[PDB]
Design a protein around this ligand. Structure first.
Ligand code: 7F2
Ligand code: 7F2
Lengths: 293, 297
């Protein structure tokens, strides 16, 4: 059945995009807002924001190709390839108006190329909790004086020999719980049930592989973005980042300043990586107000 | 029982040191040289160098505490704690004379404190393929544009919840082949037969755990070395590094210059992390020649 419970007033549905069957959850009325999840998660990370946003917007939350209930991409996992699927999906529902885009973690990687190449289609942009793939990612440290670093998983997941799938298979729940909590400030929000739901979804063999193929394409995404970034983003943009353990801190806004002419940023003290869940109410408020103004 | 074949004329034996039974392989005659292995391996990485050194030296190659056939340490896994075991082991065989030291990878971590605290006991020193634990390790990148990050495994192995043992238990042979080859230039020397030998040893549950406790103690070792490094090393030192995939390149010598007054360095082209096996002929030559500048049999 459904991997995650659908909110009242929303529908779980599918659309073929370039031969790939994409799953999404959709509700509401008005101009379109697309919410794009990241690693370890699915559309469901947005399930608290979606009903509030649906009071003023049509809201669509897709599963990334190969994750949740979406088929793997038939082209590839680089940012430019994946962004085609998400752009065409959004245009099926908002052909005559620009739409809003909210993205978390690798949802940024998988949307930035279509934002920069189709700027007239993007009304307002919200990015949270991950670098746009560029040379700045090569400066993050492998190890810190307090223990494990924030992004050593870039190398673990990008390694060949199916290193990550092979070590994590049979231990998917254990690994995801450790990964979520090592990047969280507020772990209490991750109940047994919620961890069970996310672990069952990404443990599907094609989804476990899909998860890491996004990282195996990361250097290709960096190289793609080096050319794309010659064009700055002109639409109103907001960045959000956690200020606590697991948070990107000032990096999110400071990077975005190099990409966007019109950008405002917020750092949320006491919040880590998983902003829609760790800090749902303030994150929801900031997104709703930014998109409603 | 012997996890690895002893070279002809060498003996495999044990010595209790501060309540810990240490395994070693010993042969030859003359002044003492101690060879100290690194992560993923045992004394056996030295087995091709040992017979040539034993023509001029007494050679001892111990298994690090918890690894190979050595018991885990009873104090802890920080560099200063482990170095006590290795210093006392060496001085049992060379109580009245300084000895030479060769160390690879975390063998460096586990010997640097006893070298700096007992400088008169160390005649000549050879370090290869790992940083001495200090603030420089916090500058290595998590992810690279070309090749692969050299030390992302520091975070993996140091992570809480026994993350590394829990994921690697039952897959030790798979993991070690990937780890070794990903850090090599000349991967072809790591035959399935050789990988089988190394994997069987570190798959002992206490050895798998011991392996990662060295990394869980790495930040403590950094803090220890911040104090110890206020005195530079005075004895003749040589560094070796690979210049190929997995090699430390110029970092090995450049860091050692901050630690040693008398240092010469070499980068071996076409060689990665596993110098004794990837590049046995030039590495053995450099080590034998450097140690033979001092008095020998
Ligand atoms: C998603 C991208 O890999 C997780 C990001 C974690 C890095 C900083 C917390
Ligand atoms: C030993 C140190 O953990 C092997 C790792 C290789 C990285 C740089 C030498």
């Amino acid at each position: 059945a459904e991997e995650f419970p659908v909110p009242n007033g929303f529908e779980s549905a599918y659309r073929e995009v370039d031969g790939v069957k994409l799953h999404y959850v959709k509700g509401g009325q008005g101009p379109l807002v697309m919410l794009v999840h990241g690693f370890g998660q699915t559309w469901y990370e947005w399930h608290q924001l979606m009903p509030e946003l649906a009071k003023r917007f049509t809201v669509i939350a897709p599963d990334l190709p190969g994750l949740g209930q979406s088929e793997p991409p038939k082209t590839g996992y680089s940012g430019e390839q994946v962004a085609v699927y998400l752009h065409k999906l959004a245009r099926q529902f908002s052909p005559d108006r620009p739409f809003d885009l909210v993205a978390h973690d690798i949802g940024i990687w998988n949307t930035y190329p279509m934002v920069v190449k189709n700027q007239a289609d993007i009304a307002r942009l919200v990015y949270m909790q991950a670098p746009i793939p560029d040379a700045r990612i090569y400066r993050f440290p492998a190890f810190t004086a307090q223990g494990e670093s924030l992004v050593w998983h870039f190398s673990f997941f990008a390694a060949d020999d199916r290193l990550a799938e092979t070590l994590i298979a049979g231990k998917e729940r254990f690994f995801l719980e450790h990964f979520i909590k090592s990047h969280a400030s507020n772990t209490e929000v991750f109940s047994e049930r919620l961890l069970d739901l996310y672990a069952r979804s990404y443990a599907k063999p094609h989804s476990l592989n899909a998860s890491f193929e996004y990282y195996r394409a990361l250097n290709e995404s960096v190289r793609q973005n080096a050319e794309l970034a010659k064009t700055r983003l002109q639409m109103p943009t907001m960045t959000l980042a956690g200020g606590g353990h697991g948070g990107m801190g000032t990096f999110q806004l400071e990077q975005m300043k190099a990409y966007a002419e019109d950008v405002e940023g917020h750092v949320l003290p006491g919040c880590g990586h998983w902003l829609p869940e760790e800090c749902a109410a303030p994150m929801n408020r900031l997104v709703i107000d930014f998109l409603s103004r």
